């Protein structure tokens, strides 16, 4: 289910997911000087059922209620204490990410700039957004 590759990097652009599909993983990374808790989870996994989706196997290195999402997708997980500044996500087949040029850069490409993970020829591959930011 996981896509081996990360979504395409477009120079002078960034991407972000609208919501995370069930199966999405996020590494339990910690900040400099802080280590991952003993026998703890190495990854958080987005899971779900007929009533809700949520993140299982919580990371460990503020708000007491961590709300579940509607079924099929998870929301951006809340920050955990002493977490690394960069988030390492691993997406599954069917996941879409959306692009925007960085402020000060513009696109000639008309319409939506998106990338989807597809299972093509027995292997996973992200579609190429036809996007150039100048």
């Amino acid at each position, epitope marked *: 289910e996981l896509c081996d590759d990360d979504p395409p990097e477009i120079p002078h652009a960034t991407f972000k*997911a609208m*919501a995370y599909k069930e199966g999405t993983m996020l590494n339990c990374e910690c900040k400099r000087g802080f280590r991952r808790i003993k026998s703890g989870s190495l990854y958080m996994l987005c899971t779900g059922n007929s009533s809700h989706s949520s993140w299982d196997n919580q990371c460990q290195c503020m708000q007491p209620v961590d709300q579940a999402s509607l079924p099929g997708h998870c929301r951006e997980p809340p920050p955990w204490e002493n977490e690394a500044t960069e988030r390492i996500y691993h997406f599954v087949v069917g996941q879409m990410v*959306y*692009y*925007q*040029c960085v*402020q000060g850069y513009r*696109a000639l490409h008309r319409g939506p*700039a998106e990338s989807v993970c597809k299972m093509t020829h027995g292997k996973t591959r992200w579609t190429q957004p036809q996007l150039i930011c100048t």
Partner: antibody, heavy 122, light 108 residues
Framework: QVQLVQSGAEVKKPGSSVKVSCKAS????????ISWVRQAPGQGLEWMGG????????NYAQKFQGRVTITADESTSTAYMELSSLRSEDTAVYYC???????????????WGQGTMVTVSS | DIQMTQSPSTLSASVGDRVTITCRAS??????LAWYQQKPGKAPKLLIY???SLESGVPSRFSGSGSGTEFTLTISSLQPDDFATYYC?????????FGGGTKVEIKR
């Protein structure tokens, strides 16, 4: 293909707030900017601001003096424009419009909503 | 703010005529200029973006030209659907600003 459907006409007293909605019909918002432009009766077009859905980044015209708030609900593909401390000069047709490219909020507007007449009067 | 000045404010023309509408910016806007058509009671419609790129579905009788501070919209051989108001828009810098409009009306 993608269309923008706005909420119905509003009649408001001065000093109140109005919240107009702009819903995508026959598609989704994507990361294309959703912006708001108004036109006072018999006048030209005036930009109010825009938001980038998903990213959440919003820009506003300073002349509104913080009276405009623009938000987007990605799950229902609906954008909102809230204008506070309404005055008679805010009487206008308010339009929402989608950006032509993923170039933030400094874009041409390729798809427009039908417009929402807002009348501010005592 | 960048002030966009359109001229003429109004013009009278017949079906078959060529019309040229001008948009001048108070400062350079590179080529970040778009042209719209608007009929009474309706939303504006995008015709041209980036000063000269024709929008998908818009007839080829519409063409835009210009850079910096001077831009034109030309309609070659005007048709009944073209009597409307036209507006230019700059999107070089914030705030986004529009020209005052040019009404194209039927000569009789």
């Amino acid at each position: 293909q993608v269309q923008l459907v706005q909420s119905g006409a509003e009649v408001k007293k001065p000093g109140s707030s109005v919240k107009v909605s702009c819903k995508a019909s026959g598609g989704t918002f994507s990361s294309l900017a959703i912006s708001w432009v108004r036109q006072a009766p018999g006048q030209g077009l005036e930009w109010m601001g825009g938001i980038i859905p998903i990213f959440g980044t919003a820009n506003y015209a300073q002349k509104f003096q913080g009276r405009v708030t623009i938000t987007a609900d990605e799950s229902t593909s609906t954008a909102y424009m809230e204008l506070s401390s309404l005055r008679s000069e805010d009487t206008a047709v308010y339009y929402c419009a989608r950006g032509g490219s993923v170039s933030g909020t400094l874009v041409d507007f390729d798809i427009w909503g039908q417009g929402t007449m807002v009348t501010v009067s005592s | 703010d960048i002030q966009m000045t359109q001229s003429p404010s109004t013009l009278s023309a017949s079906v078959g005529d060529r019309v040229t509408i001008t948009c001048r910016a108070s400062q350079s806007i590179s080529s970040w200029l778009a042209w719209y058509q608007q009929k009474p009671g309706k939303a504006p419609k995008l015709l041209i973006y980036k000063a000269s790129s024709l929008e998908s579905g818009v007839p080829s009788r519409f063409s835009g030209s210009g850079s910096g501070t001077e831009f034109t919209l030309t309609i070659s051989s005007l048709q009944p659907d073209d009597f409307a108001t036209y507006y230019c828009q700059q999107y070089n810098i914030y705030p986004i600003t529009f020209g005052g409009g040019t009404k194209v009306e039927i000569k009789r």
